[PDB]
Amino acid sequence: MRKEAIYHRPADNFAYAYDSETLHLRLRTKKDDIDRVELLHGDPYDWQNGAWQFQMMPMRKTGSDELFDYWFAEVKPPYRRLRYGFVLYSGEEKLVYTEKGFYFEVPTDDTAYYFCFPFLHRVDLFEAPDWVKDTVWYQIFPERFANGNPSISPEGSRPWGSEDPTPTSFFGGDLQGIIDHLDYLVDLGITGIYLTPIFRSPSNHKYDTADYFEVDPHFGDKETLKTLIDRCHEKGIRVMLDAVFNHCGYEFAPFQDVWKNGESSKYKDWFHIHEFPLQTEPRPNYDTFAFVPQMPKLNTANPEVKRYLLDVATYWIREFDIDGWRLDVANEIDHEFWREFRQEVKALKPDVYILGQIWHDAMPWLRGDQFDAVMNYPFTDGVLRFFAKEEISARQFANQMMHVLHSYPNNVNEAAFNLLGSHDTSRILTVCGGDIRKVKLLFLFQLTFTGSPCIYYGDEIGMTGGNDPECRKCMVWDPMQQNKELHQHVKQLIALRKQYRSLRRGEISFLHADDEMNYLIYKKTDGDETVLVIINRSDQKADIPIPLDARGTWLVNLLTGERFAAEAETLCTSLPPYGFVLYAIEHW
Amino acid sequence: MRKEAIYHRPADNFAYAYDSETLHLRLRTKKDDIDRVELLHGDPYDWQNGAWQFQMMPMRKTGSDELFDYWFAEVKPPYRRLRYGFVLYSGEEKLVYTEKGFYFEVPTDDTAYYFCFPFLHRVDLFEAPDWVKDTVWYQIFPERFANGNPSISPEGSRPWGSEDPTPTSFFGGDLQGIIDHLDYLVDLGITGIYLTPIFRSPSNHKYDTADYFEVDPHFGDKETLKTLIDRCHEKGIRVMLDAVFNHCGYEFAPFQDVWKNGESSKYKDWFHIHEFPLQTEPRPNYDTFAFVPQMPKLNTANPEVKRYLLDVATYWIREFDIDGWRLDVANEIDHEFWREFRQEVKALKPDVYILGQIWHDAMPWLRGDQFDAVMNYPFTDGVLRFFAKEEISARQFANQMMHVLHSYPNNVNEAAFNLLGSHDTSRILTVCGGDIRKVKLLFLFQLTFTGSPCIYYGDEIGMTGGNDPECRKCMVWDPMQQNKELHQHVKQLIALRKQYRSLRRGEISFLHADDEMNYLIYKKTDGDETVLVIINRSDQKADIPIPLDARGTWLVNLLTGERFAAEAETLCTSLPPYGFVLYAIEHW
Numbered sequence A, B: 001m002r003k004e005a006i007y008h009r010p011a012d013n014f015a016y017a018y019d020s021e022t023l024h025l026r027l028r029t030k031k032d033d034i035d036r037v038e039l040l041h042g043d044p045y046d047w048q049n050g051a052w053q054f055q056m057m058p059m060r061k062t063g064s065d066e067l068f069d070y071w072f073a074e075v076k077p078p079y080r081r082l083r084y085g086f087v088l089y090s091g092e093e094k095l096v097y098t099e100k101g102f103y104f105e106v107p108t109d110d111t112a113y114y115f116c117f118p119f120l121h122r123v124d125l126f127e128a129p130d131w132v133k134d135t136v137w138y139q140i141f142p143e144r145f146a147n148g149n150p151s152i153s154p155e156g157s158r159p160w161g162s163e164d165p166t167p168t169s170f171f172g173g174d175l176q177g178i179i180d181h182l183d184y185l186v187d188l189g190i191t192g193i194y195l196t197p198i199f200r201s202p203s204n205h206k207y208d209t210a211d212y213f214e215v216d217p218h219f220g221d222k223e224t225l226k227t228l229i230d231r232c233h234e235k236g237i238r239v240m241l242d243a244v245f246n247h248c249g250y251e252f253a254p255f256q257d258v259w260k261n262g263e264s265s266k267y268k269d270w271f272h273i274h275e276f277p278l279q280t281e282p283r284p285n286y287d288t289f290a291f292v293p294q295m296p297k298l299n300t301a302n303p304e305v306k307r308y309l310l311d312v313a314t315y316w317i318r319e320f321d322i323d324g325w326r327l328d329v330a331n332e333i334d335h336e337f338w339r340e341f342r343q344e345v346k347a348l349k350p351d352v353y354i355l356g357q358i359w360h361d362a363m364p365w366l367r368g369d370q371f372d373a374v375m376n377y378p379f380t381d382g383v384l385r386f387f388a389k390e391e392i393s394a395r396q397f398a399n400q401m402m403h404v405l406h407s408y409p410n411n412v413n414e415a416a417f418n419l420l421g422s423h424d425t426s427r428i429l430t431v432c433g434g435d436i437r438k439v440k441l442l443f444l445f446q447l448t449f450t451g452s453p454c455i456y457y458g459d460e461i462g463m464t465g466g467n468d469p470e471c472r473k474c475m476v477w478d479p480m481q482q483n484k485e486l487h488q489h490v491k492q493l494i495a496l497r498k499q500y501r502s503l504r505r506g507e508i509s510f511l512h513a514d515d516e517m518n519y520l521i522y523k524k525t526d527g528d529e530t531v532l533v534i535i536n537r538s539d540q541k542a543d544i545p546i547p548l549d550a551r552g553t554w555l556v557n558l559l560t561g562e563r564f565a566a567e568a569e570t571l572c573t574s575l576p577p578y579g580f581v582l583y584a585i586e587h588w
């Protein structure tokens, strides 16, 4: 046993309360280094005949990545207090892993050797609005969805679909267009709409805000926003807006003042100014988003900027009943502001989804005192490298999925915002080099994956394009030009997702085929329900053996409806190039 | 290289801001497995070609424990944003460690492979009141320090210091007595007093609070507490009271009501009651501290309880201007409360020391939004197992120390409460089996370690006693029963600490000696000065070789003033049993 590979520390993904009386403990060890692991646990104050009263609970291996095995165990301390450690077995060898280090036999003359989870508290629990977990989102870039109102469209707005978007072009897309097509989305199966910035800004993306309390004229007005939202509610479709609090635009009144009045400005402390007077050349003398002079960074530590953004956050909630906030560049704003943002928001409307845009490991913002979830880009990376780019093996793809998942606690993973693309990346059909077969696979895994998936407008009907701005082409409404194959495929899966809970709340695990090269086999398990998926990731037909205890096992093909049983010789599924298949497993 | 022993994750002790512009990073690896490590760092948006602009920096081994080596790197990011990785070499064999796993060559087309520290925010910076860093506390158990006023001594008080303490005995200790001896403490070098519970309670230890708003009548009145706190301040001594918020006493008004009226009582929610009415036969039917009926657990989630305790919190600060709160059993209260607690305490007085009593790994309570520090018992353990009990070798001792130190951020270690014994543990002299020489060593290592040490009343004159109630004997004021040699020792060392900023705020490292069993060599360095310490932990004299490169190196014996230069002819200290010596190292 390699001690140096064994690790556990009382927090985040390793130790957390799942509910008011249940604790989740996770242990990490070198892959296949340990035969079995058992959690040694007991209440820190229970001592009889002058000896601590602890108990042994076997831990379950939940997954493996490139280097480790991860073990799980849920416990319900008698009086909500718990001291604990781990006993590892491998051959006649035995190791006891504690906070005090490794031992070869359970020490018992003292409870200080052990890791400790002081107490379970309802208020410190992590809790995201539960509805989000059964929602399938639709990300829309207004300027490119549908010009429902040709009168407010910006001047110069080129004919719909005329040519490719430029970082500065316009096509008159607006809030009405969204309202005008809700029928298309309801049909598709969408139950949530995430809109990129829609407030006042000179650009076509609106990330350089000029007025947070004003819907941008070229989209509509407050009256129009209410109608879209209200109308969305009736069709059972939650709405979420993008909140750009990290930075303002070159035309944000408070900034224009500093720009003109210098250090005497009443707003000079609303930004990160290094010295006056403000200057743009050679380069800004103030902080900005990246190195964009048009996007000056706001000082969320300044009490007035804080009070301002909180009000902006509660205004649209209180007055328009939005269901969520997509915090743009959320990781660049202080944890303190985020802690207040959650208090203000949740007090006003508890079930509002607070989603942070963090392009990397986000454990620090996901401890229940800040964001409910964060856009899962690591997910996108992994999924695209395997299904679209075919760069990594099935085995590896399984290790990456297992890795990222075990990086956060279960209750966090259940509310994750899984996306395959957005207005910040190339189109998936394009990443797939135009191969619709590969894409269908992307949609399959995303829709069979636990969390809160989000589809980028057009993706369902095969829209193409490279990275920004090529990915922001005008939505395709002409049927003779939109892929019907994909559309029904996505409509098909969104459906199966609703019928099978295990598909949206289930635990996931990968089965190993002798050839973990192109064959990916995994299964979701809500606990009761149990779906199995098999995907042939290769351009050639394949006979994939499907491992499963044939004793009292029945499968139900979720595509055809067909059904059948399993015997001594476990059935072998045949799939065409890039074929897949979903089976519902029943144990009788 | 063993990939399984290599580890880093963008948070807590591995990645944090040291100040408004500096950022600290750690990386651990299998012991002696890597030769050198370079930090690959660069701003996330700094691009030119299709390459991300980064710089390489060397990381220095800051120490190592039983299994790993720990590397360090201090970086002041140009625009306060950072993306980074690690290049590990072993005999000039590259290996790149990133958030996306390992590679042989450095990734360069995308910054998503890299760990990330989004932004350095002054407001999220961890920050404990600076004065503590130089303070040396003296914990007093009121009922046993001095009887400066007999008239208010409980009936039954036994002749001071004549009998052994019992769980229910009293000797007449009072606040007036502490006032009568402040000179003894000023003479000692003490610059801060931590008092155990002093608010109204029936027991002698006062942990079963009857009323959080009144001083126990037997200790004195608000008038006297004023006098004490003011005279301390006059002599430059901070005062820290004990906060028992986890659980109230049996005689606590709101609890007496819940007991009388039962389920009717408007205080029913104030506690953790399972079923009405209250009882205690098999075990209490309401949560308690451990299983102590007379100590019912408070419900800090209830807004009334929370308002009450917070009022108690700020009351004493406002009315008596105490300098810190020692939060009893702090770990069993929720984090949501500790966050409010800080906001309120710190709002009222930014320089109050919020010390939480947590008997284990406290990273969760030491992130900056809660406690400024915790009572470091792991330090107490490590130190006692080496100097007192002699159950571990010096290399092992160094390991544990390096372990507990690398588990926390440097600025957190800077405000650590380092105690060697308390009212809840046995007397260090008794643990040392009566060997003053060993106690001398304990104070040495303690009074030369970075942080906020704390002496327990009587340990400076060598009092004795086993664990509670034995450690609670009356203070001994007869110099005929005090151990002067020891007293002068403590005094002597508190002076050296006051003199050398390296001793109290410097960095520590352990030099590999010849006999890695009983000879301990270590030094404290805060860039500027450097003090060297050499200990001989054995019952026989020894000629220990001092490990130093003789080139413009001068040593100044910090005990005798004796001075001399480094030459391969005088780098060997000859010590007697349990002998020790300190040197100031001058680099000329």
Ligand SMILES: OC[C@H]1O[C@H](O[C@H]2[C@H](O)[C@@H](O)[C@@H](O[C@H]3[C@H](O)[C@@H](O)[C@@H](O[C@H]4[C@H](O)[C@@H](O)[C@@H](O)O[C@@H]4CO)O[C@@H]3CO)O[C@@H]2CO)[C@H](O)[C@@H](O)[C@@H]1O
Pocket (backbone or CB within 6 Å): A205, A207, A208, A289, A292, A295, A328, A329, A330, A357, A359, A423, A424, A468, B044, B110, B111, B112
């Ligand atoms: O004027 C500049 C740009 O402004 C607008 O971009 C927006 C995005 O649309 C938002 O989604 C967001 O995105 C940022 C992101 O927050 C930031 O971390 C960074 O992301 C990196 C990522 O960390 C890195 O690992 C790698 O993947 O590259 C990413 C770059 O995309 O950058 C994103 C922006 O590219 O915030 C920005 C700023 O508001 C507008 O949409 C763009 O057209 C415009 O160029």
Ligand SMILES: OC[C@H]1O[C@H](O[C@H]2[C@H](O)[C@@H](O)[C@@H](O[C@H]3[C@H](O)[C@@H](O)[C@@H](O[C@H]4[C@H](O)[C@@H](O)[C@@H](O)O[C@@H]4CO)O[C@@H]3CO)O[C@@H]2CO)[C@H](O)[C@@H](O)[C@@H]1O
Pocket (backbone or CB within 6 Å): A044, A110, A111, A112, B205, B207, B244, B289, B292, B328, B329, B330, B357, B359, B423, B424, B468
């Ligand atoms: O009647 C009960 C006792 O009440 C009083 O005890 C106090 C202590 O003086 C405080 O310092 C504190 O101590 C707790 C501590 O907070 C708690 O974590 C626990 O500590 C254990 C630790 O968990 C365990 O791993 C091991 O290391 O032992 C530690 C202590 O031995 O228990 C401590 C209590 O001993 O709070 C209690 C309760 O207010 C009173 O002083 C005692 O005389 C009395 O017995």
